[PDB]
Write a protein that binds this DNA or RNA. Structure first.
Ligand SMILES: [K+]
Ligand SMILES: [Mg+2]
Ligand SMILES: [Mg+2]
Ligand SMILES: [Mg+2]
Ligand SMILES: [Mg+2]
Ligand SMILES: [Mg+2]
Ligand SMILES: [Mg+2]
Ligand SMILES: [Mg+2]
Ligand SMILES: [Mg+2]
Ligand SMILES: [Mg+2]
Ligand SMILES: [Mg+2]
Ligand SMILES: [Mg+2]
Ligand SMILES: [Mg+2]
Ligand SMILES: [Mg+2]
Ligand SMILES: [Mg+2]
Ligand SMILES: [Mg+2]
Ligand SMILES: [Mg+2]
Ligand SMILES: [Mg+2]
Ligand SMILES: [Mg+2]
Ligand SMILES: [Mg+2]
Ligand SMILES: [Mg+2]
Ligand SMILES: [Mg+2]
Ligand SMILES: [Mg+2]
Ligand SMILES: [Mg+2]
Ligand SMILES: [Mg+2]
Ligand SMILES: [Mg+2]
Ligand SMILES: [Mg+2]
Ligand SMILES: [Mg+2]
Ligand SMILES: [Mg+2]
Ligand SMILES: [Mg+2]
Ligand SMILES: [Mg+2]
Ligand SMILES: [Mg+2]
Ligand SMILES: [Mg+2]
Ligand SMILES: [Mg+2]
Ligand SMILES: [Mg+2]
Ligand SMILES: [Mg+2]
Ligand SMILES: [Mg+2]
Ligand SMILES: [Mg+2]
Ligand SMILES: [Mg+2]
Ligand SMILES: [Mg+2]
Ligand SMILES: [Mg+2]
Ligand SMILES: [Mg+2]
Ligand SMILES: [Mg+2]
Ligand SMILES: [Mg+2]
Ligand SMILES: [Mg+2]
Ligand SMILES: [Mg+2]
Ligand SMILES: [Mg+2]
Ligand SMILES: [Mg+2]
Ligand SMILES: [Mg+2]
Ligand SMILES: [Mg+2]
Ligand SMILES: [Mg+2]
Ligand SMILES: [Mg+2]
Ligand SMILES: [Mg+2]
Ligand SMILES: [Mg+2]
Ligand SMILES: [Mg+2]
Ligand SMILES: [Mg+2]
Ligand SMILES: [Mg+2]
Ligand SMILES: [Mg+2]
Ligand SMILES: [Mg+2]
Ligand SMILES: [Mg+2]
Ligand SMILES: [Mg+2]
Ligand SMILES: [Mg+2]
Ligand SMILES: [Mg+2]
Ligand SMILES: [Mg+2]
Ligand SMILES: [Mg+2]
Ligand SMILES: [Mg+2]
Ligand SMILES: [Mg+2]
Ligand SMILES: [Mg+2]
Ligand SMILES: [Mg+2]
Ligand SMILES: [Mg+2]
Ligand SMILES: [Mg+2]
Ligand SMILES: [Mg+2]
Ligand SMILES: [Mg+2]
Ligand SMILES: [Mg+2]
Ligand SMILES: [Mg+2]
Ligand SMILES: [Mg+2]
Ligand SMILES: [Mg+2]
Ligand SMILES: [Mg+2]
Ligand SMILES: [Mg+2]
Ligand SMILES: [Mg+2]
Ligand SMILES: [Mg+2]
Ligand SMILES: [Mg+2]
Ligand SMILES: [Mg+2]
Ligand SMILES: [Mg+2]
Ligand SMILES: [Mg+2]
Ligand SMILES: [Mg+2]
Ligand SMILES: [Mg+2]
Ligand SMILES: [Mg+2]
Ligand SMILES: [Mg+2]
Ligand SMILES: [Mg+2]
Ligand SMILES: [Mg+2]
Ligand SMILES: [Mg+2]
Ligand SMILES: [Mg+2]
Ligand SMILES: [Mg+2]
Ligand SMILES: [Mg+2]
Ligand SMILES: [Mg+2]
Ligand SMILES: [Mg+2]
Ligand SMILES: [Mg+2]
Ligand SMILES: [Mg+2]
Ligand SMILES: [Mg+2]
Ligand SMILES: [Mg+2]
Ligand SMILES: [Mg+2]
Ligand SMILES: [Mg+2]
Ligand SMILES: [Mg+2]
Ligand SMILES: [Mg+2]
Ligand SMILES: [Mg+2]
Ligand SMILES: [Mg+2]
Ligand SMILES: [Mg+2]
Ligand SMILES: [Mg+2]
Ligand SMILES: [Mg+2]
Ligand SMILES: [Mg+2]
Ligand SMILES: [Mg+2]
Ligand SMILES: [Mg+2]
Ligand SMILES: [Mg+2]
Ligand SMILES: [Mg+2]
Ligand SMILES: [Mg+2]
Ligand SMILES: [Mg+2]
Ligand SMILES: [Mg+2]
Ligand SMILES: [Mg+2]
Ligand SMILES: [Mg+2]
Ligand SMILES: [Mg+2]
Ligand SMILES: [Mg+2]
Ligand SMILES: [Mg+2]
Ligand SMILES: [Mg+2]
Ligand SMILES: [Mg+2]
Ligand SMILES: [Mg+2]
Ligand SMILES: [Mg+2]
Ligand SMILES: [Mg+2]
Ligand SMILES: [Mg+2]
Ligand SMILES: [Mg+2]
Ligand SMILES: [Mg+2]
Ligand SMILES: [Mg+2]
Ligand SMILES: [Mg+2]
Ligand SMILES: [Mg+2]
Ligand SMILES: [Mg+2]
Ligand SMILES: [Mg+2]
Ligand SMILES: [Mg+2]
Ligand SMILES: [Mg+2]
Ligand SMILES: [Mg+2]
Ligand SMILES: [Mg+2]
Ligand SMILES: [Mg+2]
Ligand SMILES: [Mg+2]
Ligand SMILES: [Mg+2]
Ligand SMILES: [Mg+2]
Ligand SMILES: [Mg+2]
Ligand SMILES: [Mg+2]
Ligand SMILES: [Mg+2]
Ligand SMILES: [Mg+2]
Ligand SMILES: [Mg+2]
Ligand SMILES: [Mg+2]
Ligand SMILES: [Mg+2]
Ligand SMILES: [Mg+2]
Ligand SMILES: [Mg+2]
Ligand SMILES: [Mg+2]
Ligand SMILES: [Mg+2]
Ligand SMILES: [Mg+2]
Ligand SMILES: [Mg+2]
Ligand SMILES: [Mg+2]
Ligand SMILES: [Mg+2]
Ligand SMILES: [Mg+2]
Ligand SMILES: [Mg+2]
Ligand SMILES: [Mg+2]
Ligand SMILES: [Mg+2]
Ligand SMILES: [Mg+2]
Ligand SMILES: [Mg+2]
Ligand SMILES: [Mg+2]
Ligand SMILES: [Mg+2]
Ligand SMILES: [Mg+2]
Ligand SMILES: [Mg+2]
Ligand SMILES: [Mg+2]
Ligand SMILES: [Mg+2]
Ligand SMILES: [Mg+2]
Ligand SMILES: [Mg+2]
Ligand SMILES: [Mg+2]
Ligand SMILES: [Mg+2]
Ligand SMILES: [Mg+2]
Ligand SMILES: [Mg+2]
Ligand SMILES: [Mg+2]
Ligand SMILES: [Mg+2]
Ligand SMILES: [Mg+2]
Ligand SMILES: [Mg+2]
Ligand SMILES: [Mg+2]
Ligand SMILES: [Mg+2]
Ligand SMILES: [Mg+2]
Ligand SMILES: [Mg+2]
Ligand SMILES: [Mg+2]
Ligand SMILES: [Mg+2]
Ligand SMILES: [Mg+2]
Ligand SMILES: [Mg+2]
Ligand SMILES: [Mg+2]
Ligand SMILES: [Mg+2]
Ligand SMILES: [Mg+2]
Ligand SMILES: [Mg+2]
Ligand SMILES: [Mg+2]
Ligand SMILES: [Mg+2]
Ligand SMILES: [Mg+2]
Ligand SMILES: [Mg+2]
Ligand SMILES: [Mg+2]
Ligand SMILES: [Mg+2]
Lengths: 275, 48
RNA sequence: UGGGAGAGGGUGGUGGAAUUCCCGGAGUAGCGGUGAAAUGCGCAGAUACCGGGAGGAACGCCGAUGGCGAAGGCAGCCACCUGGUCCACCCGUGACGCUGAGGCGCGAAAGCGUGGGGAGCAAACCGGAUUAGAUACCCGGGUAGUCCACGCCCUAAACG
RNA sequence: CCGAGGGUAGGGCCCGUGACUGGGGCGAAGUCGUAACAAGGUAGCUGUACCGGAAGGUGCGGCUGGAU
RNA sequence: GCGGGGUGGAGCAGCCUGGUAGCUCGUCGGGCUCAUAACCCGAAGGUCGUCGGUUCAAAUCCGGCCCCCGCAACCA
RNA sequence: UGGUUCGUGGAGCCAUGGGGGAAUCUGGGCGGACCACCGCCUAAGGCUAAGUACUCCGGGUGACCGAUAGCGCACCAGUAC
RNA sequence: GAGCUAGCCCUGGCCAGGGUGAAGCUGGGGUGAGACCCAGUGGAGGCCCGAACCGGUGGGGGAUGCAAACCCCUCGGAUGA
RNA sequence: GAAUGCCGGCAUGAGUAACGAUAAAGAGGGUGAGAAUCCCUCUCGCCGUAAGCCCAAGGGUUCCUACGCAAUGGUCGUCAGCGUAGGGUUAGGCGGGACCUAAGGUGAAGCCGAAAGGCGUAGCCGAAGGGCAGCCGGUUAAUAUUCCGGCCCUUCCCGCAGGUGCGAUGGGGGGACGCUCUAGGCUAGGGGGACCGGAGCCAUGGACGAGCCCGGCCAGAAGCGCAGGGUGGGAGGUAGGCAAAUCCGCCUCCCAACAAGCUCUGCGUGGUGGGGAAGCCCGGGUGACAACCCCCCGAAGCCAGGGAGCCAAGAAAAGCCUCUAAGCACAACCUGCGGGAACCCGUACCGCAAACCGACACAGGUGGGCGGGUGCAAGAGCACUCAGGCGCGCGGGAGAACCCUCGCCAAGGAACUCUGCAAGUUGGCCCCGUAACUUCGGGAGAAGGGGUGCUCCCUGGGGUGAUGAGCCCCGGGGAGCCGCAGUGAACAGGCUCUGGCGACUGUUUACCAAAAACACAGCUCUCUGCGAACUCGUAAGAGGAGGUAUAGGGAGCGACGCUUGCCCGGUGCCGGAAGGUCAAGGGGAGGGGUGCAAGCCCCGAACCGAAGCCCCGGUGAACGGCGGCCGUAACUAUAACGGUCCUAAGGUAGCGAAAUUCCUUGUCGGGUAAGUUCCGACCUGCACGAAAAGCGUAACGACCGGAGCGCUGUCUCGGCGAGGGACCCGGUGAAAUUGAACUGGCCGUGAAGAUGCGGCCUACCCGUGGCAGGACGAAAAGACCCCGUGGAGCUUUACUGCAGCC
RNA sequence: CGAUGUCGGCUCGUCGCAUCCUGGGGCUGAAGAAGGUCCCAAGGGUUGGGCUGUUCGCCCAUUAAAGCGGCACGCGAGCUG
């Protein structure tokens, strides 16, 4: 669930944390962790290209297997369920019968000790990876490749899934986490089921510092700035917007669609998103 | 208070050093210029 | 001990009809609605018809004046888990019973919190008509809500 | 030592009272509408929510103390 | 100090573009009703804030006076 | 678009980023939109002295300065600071 | 020019000593089982007091200053953004 | 001769201010031409979580001696961080390199850019991170983990022996890790001893004493001992760890498992080598053959890669171990001996400071370690004091005003004042005891009160010992003594009530604003399907993100509670394969030029021709907006009701003289003797109002209002005292300012405020301490205002462009 | 305008008189007492508080009275802010 605190300090009043119920191994696999280069939000020009980032906890990057069709027909056992700081989701450690050890994003209902596999031959059972065309229409699925062999790009966030709507030619029809209706190629791989830790969204950070722990520096409102800095800058005392609400760089930020109309992928998007 | 000048030999050599100068076209011009005026030092003295 | 009837309760699945919406055909000068109309939708191609897709809710005929439950209440179908009850044989125990201030659980609808869902319906609301007025009754729309999960609320013409 | 009591400091209950404010009860022939009683001219009553000058209306479920 | 306004009883057209004062309500008369409101049929009432000028002619165009509601009054 | 005196002008000429795209002397460019006549010239390969520029350097000469002048420095000055 | 200053990156380091006593765990009551109450244990926190250290609230002094921002008295944070 | 001119020189202010923390001096004796200031001694005072000691930056000879005193030194100077000369820094083991990586930097390959250049994988560079071999003592005027002595260790090369399938920039293990809490055992360090060693000492009434005073250790290989760290063992298979593999990984099997074993650390002991006080004899000699023991306290340090809990999930690479590959097995490596070999750089001295950063020998700034003892509950607080260091580089007097810093004050007790500003009060610990309200944590240290020393007696539990004595940490009960007073000194909250605003901890205008502002968890809107959107860049390339809609960007609002109404006509935005316009282009009715012509050249209407705009729609937690005039109730007053005009629609709930109320100190009530402030009401709200959020809210606040109690020099109202200045003397000696000055008052006059002109009056010459009315005193070419066809920043549906997007 | 610091307070005064009080008077619709009103007179005096930044003013308690004005709305090289 979601663990609560008694209000013994003001921020403790609302702060909520993960239950970590599913977690079975509390340190990572040495052979599978590489160092994380923290950016600060700065590019190779040294320039801040993403505002309000930095100062967060040190992290190691667990290398995750987003391919899976590496080891086709080679089964693996669920050795443990672990903490990854780099994603909303949890990661499952697999010991293959090969001896090879890899990480995958852990789906909901995945239990430690069960045996998972990848391939056309695979059973439709939670934690298995098949190319989409061999998965029964109407079944929940995650970790979806966008193009064949190019890597798992869809539904990797805690509690997300995409569902298989139907088929047409060499493509299948998916409903993504956003509720968009997409044509994804038939040979694109996908893991059945949805990502675990679906109680993620119910977490209440509780205080400024919690955000700062996450590498999230304070976000300052344009309205609080000056005309040199923002369209919403200036004015004597508090001021309304006074123009169409805008970004620091001047584009409109309420409702202005931005995705490039002539994008080649337009041919493959059936229905724009949901709510 | 803390003042503006905090001597640091590594910083000096790396910012205004001869090797620093020679890399950048502007730095080389500083050298050319200082050589033309006949400066005794083309570059700050620092004990390495 | 053996036997029966049942929308009693819970969990998980699954079926077709209908409305809406989306796509493709074919097709044209209106459709819708009323007491009569107007708003509304439709040559930017609607209504009516055929094909395909998605999604939600409710279960037609059976269906009864019927059945179950202590009450609230319970209705497609399938399985699991589970309560109460009646009958028969007269086998077991031997008054172990009845009621019940407190307590405790249950408790339609609405409403509330967090998250999902949202086809139809529809407080609020907007528009059109009626009307002296019409903050209504009727009409075209429409948000919460109705639906699922969990936790609250604990009311009733909770009636025989 | 105890000790009537006096003093200081904070609590509890009752009483009277207060600019103002909330509805209540009464008050021969006030202003507005007409909700209910006949199918009361939209059956009524209802718990609840929301709304409106006001009675009231509407939604959701319920009862007949309604249909004739 | 700058602006709009003044017209049957009430609220508003007409002025801009001179000649022709209108719309809803109210008032009155007659209907329907046992009666009243609603409703139906007809009717009256402004002489245009006043004073002067322009004009053949002024609600209408120009100028004073009175009123009537607006907007401003900043740098110290 | 640039260059020429030429700022779109009647705007040729020389150059060229884009599109199209020939011919070999009966070929081709030019003579200020364009046409015809009359001429001038021979693109899309390269090189080429002298006359011209300048003064770190050496010298010559000043109706040039004469230590606040003359170079920033007559002197251990691009120094001390 | 980031040897001041502002943000980020990498690698090191500092935070006397007291105080409060969350979750959990154990035991006891409890109930069909629970929720739950009790005691002990425990040692949470942009928790409390307060040095170092980081500040700079109120006042006074200083004002060709000790100082081109200082001094004294007081006052803020002090396991955390 | 003037430019607040430029350069230089010298004046004035002036023998004036000042001579840099108020920690403080006095005397004797040396030196010497000269001494408050240099040397020596005694006395006195100051620092001692430093103002003492080590280390790193930085400084660069300042270090040590000798000789000096012109300048530097805020005075003097015989002294010096000054001048001159000489001397001084010693390493295989300490630091850095010949080792390794981090951010970052650079960069074969590769990419991009007019040129310069930008980027970039591997590699390489890059350290206060990882790895790595020295500890104690003596010595010099000055160096010492470096020289010397004792004990100890590392690498390289060669050789001997035993041993093995040897061999790597390749594989694999290890290296390798957070925050908080914390066990066991030690050590650093400390306290005590009736014990051991010690020169001495008996004072002034007492003490020859179990009296005083002093000291009672340091380093140390192998071995052993204690405490910990790390590590399972053996087979079979194996398709994975880009080749191989007996290594690791996976599966199976046997065995055993907080043991043990194996190995690695720390502490102890340890052959040995050192060290060794007070006192008084001139740094040394002596003590001294010094003693070198026992008990207690006890780390934040060691064992350390220990343990536990938590979430925010906590570097790399080499050294080292292992696996094999070319290769090679006369080699090669492993082990133990042994000889040999072991380079470059730093090393002085300052280092919280007179040697570093601040123009200064500057009350400022500067990272790390050590930082003794007693007492106060603790402590790095506080007072004293040890080792050690200092009395701050002008003094001597006097005892005015006035200023600073400080102490006390009769009666009053906020009457002071914008304000209790400031200063009192309160103050630690222990015990009792504590309200509204609340989100059940809190509010709480609420408030309020009691105790606090010392002596004797009895006693209760813990650590170490042993289960005891002793030492040591917690306590409890009774009887007494003293003073004005027992946290007797120093350090250490005044409290309450009620409003506004912001939930809260935080943050901010370096150097006049710390707030109510920013931030914040949280809420909603919106964009984005991943080669994402968006940001940076001409680009390449990055960030986003090694992320993937429970995610990332943008925007408003800003815990939480109850809520967030009506307007889509204008603007934005979103949707709309129609219609209207629409640029290049296409198309070429038809005209035009020239030509004898074939021809070349030019204009050119219809018609087809995108986005955009028009147009049709949707949209408010999008830009925004949310009426007027008349009448009307069986008293008056008011208007639930009505009439009409306009609008896209006419402000809902909740609030309201408000951080908003002009009229205004609105009116009423409360508090006060008295209240333009305050709180509570009313509502004709100049000009609240619902995420530029509305109405509330416990807790919080160096924010801003109002009040009360306490207590006070704030005040009535001032008085006295203290020190540092002011003042006098010796030493040193500035500054701004300054047209020149032989520089009075009144009434006038004058460019309208006269020392300077007129009349009058007054006045000997010259200083010193004082006060500030004037010299329209100083300072700054008014910052307000205007002017200038001066400038800049910012804005927009001003103009014209440009990037960017379509 | 190459600068004449600007409200109010505090402190320190001084001047005017168109007199608030005290002294002296005339007229009174002056019985007395207590007033009204005018003349003379500037010697001295002219309170402490609540509210506001306030000057002013209102209020409280007194008073013989609680005067009004000038001095750069007297006075910031005197202070406050
Ligand atoms: K101004
Ligand atoms: Mg919580
Ligand atoms: Mg979990
Ligand atoms: Mg690694
Ligand atoms: Mg770079
Ligand atoms: Mg750069
Ligand atoms: Mg950004
Ligand atoms: Mg950033
Ligand atoms: Mg995770
Ligand atoms: Mg983080
Ligand atoms: Mg913000
Ligand atoms: Mg601002
Ligand atoms: Mg800027
Ligand atoms: Mg802008
Ligand atoms: Mg703005
Ligand atoms: Mg501003
Ligand atoms: Mg603003
Ligand atoms: Mg404003
Ligand atoms: Mg706004
Ligand atoms: Mg854009
Ligand atoms: Mg979509
Ligand atoms: Mg500071
Ligand atoms: Mg500092
Ligand atoms: Mg350096
Ligand atoms: Mg540096
Ligand atoms: Mg350099
Ligand atoms: Mg030279
Ligand atoms: Mg240089
Ligand atoms: Mg058509
Ligand atoms: Mg029997
Ligand atoms: Mg119920
Ligand atoms: Mg409710
Ligand atoms: Mg609610
Ligand atoms: Mg409907
Ligand atoms: Mg008595
Ligand atoms: Mg009814
Ligand atoms: Mg009725
Ligand atoms: Mg009815
Ligand atoms: Mg009716
Ligand atoms: Mg109404
Ligand atoms: Mg309704
Ligand atoms: Mg009936
Ligand atoms: Mg008109
Ligand atoms: Mg007309
Ligand atoms: Mg007429
Ligand atoms: Mg009758
Ligand atoms: Mg032109
Ligand atoms: Mg032209
Ligand atoms: Mg031309
Ligand atoms: Mg030709
Ligand atoms: Mg040509
Ligand atoms: Mg020619
Ligand atoms: Mg010609
Ligand atoms: Mg030619
Ligand atoms: Mg040719
Ligand atoms: Mg030539
Ligand atoms: Mg001459
Ligand atoms: Mg000369
Ligand atoms: Mg020369
Ligand atoms: Mg920096
Ligand atoms: Mg704690
Ligand atoms: Mg804290
Ligand atoms: Mg420390
Ligand atoms: Mg103070
Ligand atoms: Mg200053
Ligand atoms: Mg200070
Ligand atoms: Mg504190
Ligand atoms: Mg002249
Ligand atoms: Mg001058
Ligand atoms: Mg001159
Ligand atoms: Mg002179
Ligand atoms: Mg003198
Ligand atoms: Mg003088
Ligand atoms: Mg002096
Ligand atoms: Mg001094
Ligand atoms: Mg001084
Ligand atoms: Mg002293
Ligand atoms: Mg001498
Ligand atoms: Mg001295
Ligand atoms: Mg000490
Ligand atoms: Mg120096
Ligand atoms: Mg000298
Ligand atoms: Mg000197
Ligand atoms: Mg001297
Ligand atoms: Mg050595
Ligand atoms: Mg070598
Ligand atoms: Mg390297
Ligand atoms: Mg580069
Ligand atoms: Mg290196
Ligand atoms: Mg290193
Ligand atoms: Mg490390
Ligand atoms: Mg070393
Ligand atoms: Mg050693
Ligand atoms: Mg051998
Ligand atoms: Mg071996
Ligand atoms: Mg080998
Ligand atoms: Mg690691
Ligand atoms: Mg933590
Ligand atoms: Mg321990
Ligand atoms: Mg030791
Ligand atoms: Mg001790
Ligand atoms: Mg001892
Ligand atoms: Mg004696
Ligand atoms: Mg293998
Ligand atoms: Mg292999
Ligand atoms: Mg094997
Ligand atoms: Mg000795
Ligand atoms: Mg001896
Ligand atoms: Mg550990
Ligand atoms: Mg690396
Ligand atoms: Mg071979
Ligand atoms: Mg051989
Ligand atoms: Mg070498
Ligand atoms: Mg040395
Ligand atoms: Mg230090
Ligand atoms: Mg020094
Ligand atoms: Mg400087
Ligand atoms: Mg000094
Ligand atoms: Mg100093
Ligand atoms: Mg200095
Ligand atoms: Mg210590
Ligand atoms: Mg203490
Ligand atoms: Mg004197
Ligand atoms: Mg007193
Ligand atoms: Mg008092
Ligand atoms: Mg008192
Ligand atoms: Mg006062
Ligand atoms: Mg106050
Ligand atoms: Mg105070
Ligand atoms: Mg105290
Ligand atoms: Mg409570
Ligand atoms: Mg207390
Ligand atoms: Mg005593
Ligand atoms: Mg305190
Ligand atoms: Mg207020
Ligand atoms: Mg705050
Ligand atoms: Mg709040
Ligand atoms: Mg906040
Ligand atoms: Mg500031
Ligand atoms: Mg500044
Ligand atoms: Mg500033
Ligand atoms: Mg200040
Ligand atoms: Mg503050
Ligand atoms: Mg401040
Ligand atoms: Mg804020
Ligand atoms: Mg919120
Ligand atoms: Mg850009
Ligand atoms: Mg760009
Ligand atoms: Mg990345
Ligand atoms: Mg805000
Ligand atoms: Mg509440
Ligand atoms: Mg609108
Ligand atoms: Mg619109
Ligand atoms: Mg619209
Ligand atoms: Mg178009
Ligand atoms: Mg709104
Ligand atoms: Mg009336
Ligand atoms: Mg309003
Ligand atoms: Mg409303
Ligand atoms: Mg009001
Ligand atoms: Mg008031
Ligand atoms: Mg207002
Ligand atoms: Mg007012
Ligand atoms: Mg008043
Ligand atoms: Mg009162
Ligand atoms: Mg006041
Ligand atoms: Mg009030
Ligand atoms: Mg009013
Ligand atoms: Mg708003
Ligand atoms: Mg509150
Ligand atoms: Mg504050
Ligand atoms: Mg005083
Ligand atoms: Mg004195
Ligand atoms: Mg001198
Ligand atoms: Mg006179
Ligand atoms: Mg005069
Ligand atoms: Mg004259
Ligand atoms: Mg005269
Ligand atoms: Mg003066
Ligand atoms: Mg100037
Ligand atoms: Mg000027
Ligand atoms: Mg200024
Ligand atoms: Mg100026
Ligand atoms: Mg002006
Ligand atoms: Mg102009
Ligand atoms: Mg002009
Ligand atoms: Mg002026
Ligand atoms: Mg002046
Ligand atoms: Mg008089
Ligand atoms: Mg009399
Ligand atoms: Mg009388
Ligand atoms: Mg007088
Ligand atoms: Mg006043
Ligand atoms: Mg007033
Ligand atoms: Mg009298
Ligand atoms: Mg005046
Ligand atoms: Mg004045
Ligand atoms: Mg003043
Ligand atoms: Mg003056």
């Amino acid at each position: 669930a979601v663990k609560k605190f008694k209000p013994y300090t003001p921020s403790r009043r609302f702060m909520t944390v993960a239950d970590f119920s599913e977690i079975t191994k509390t340190e990572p696999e040495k052979s599978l962790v590489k160092p994380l280069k923290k950016t600060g939000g700065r590019n190779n020009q040294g320039r801040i290209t993403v505002r309000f980032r930095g100062g967060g906890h040190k992290r190691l990057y667990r290398i995750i297997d987003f391919k899976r069709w590496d080891k086709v027909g080679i089964p693996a056992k669920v050795a443990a369920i672990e903490y990854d700081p780099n994603r909303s989701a949890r990661i499952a450690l697999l010991h293959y019968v090969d001896g090879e050890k890899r990480y995958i994003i852990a789906p909901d209902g995945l239990q430690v000790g069960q045996q998972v596999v990848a391939g056309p031959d695979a059973p439709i059972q939670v934690g298995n990876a098949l190319p989409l065309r061999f998965i029964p229409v109407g079944t929940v699925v995650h970790a979806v490749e966008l193009e064949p062999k190019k890597g798992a790009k869809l539904a990797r966030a805690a509690g997300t899934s995409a569902q298989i709507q139907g088929r047409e030619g060499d493509y299948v029809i998916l409903r993504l986490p956003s509720g968009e209706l997409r044509k994804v190629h038939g040979e694109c791989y996908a893991t059945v089921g949805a990502v675990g830790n679906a109680d993620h969204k119910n977490i209440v950070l509780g205080k400024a510092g919690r955000s700062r722990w996450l590498g999230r520096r304070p976000h300052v409102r344009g309205a609080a700035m000056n005309p040199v800095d923002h369209p919403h800058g200036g004015g004597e005392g508090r001021a309304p917007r006074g123009r169409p609400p805008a970004s620091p760089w001047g584009w409109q930020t309420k409702g202005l669609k931005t995705r490039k109309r002539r994008k080649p992928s337009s041919r493959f998007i059936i229905a724009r998103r949901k709510k | 208070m803390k003042r503006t000048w905090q001597p640091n030999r590594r910083k000096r050599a790396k910012t205004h050093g001869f090797r620093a100068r020679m890399r950048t076209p502007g730095g080389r011009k500083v050298l050319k210029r200082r050589r033309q005026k006949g400066r005794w030092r083309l570059t700050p003295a620092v004990r390495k």
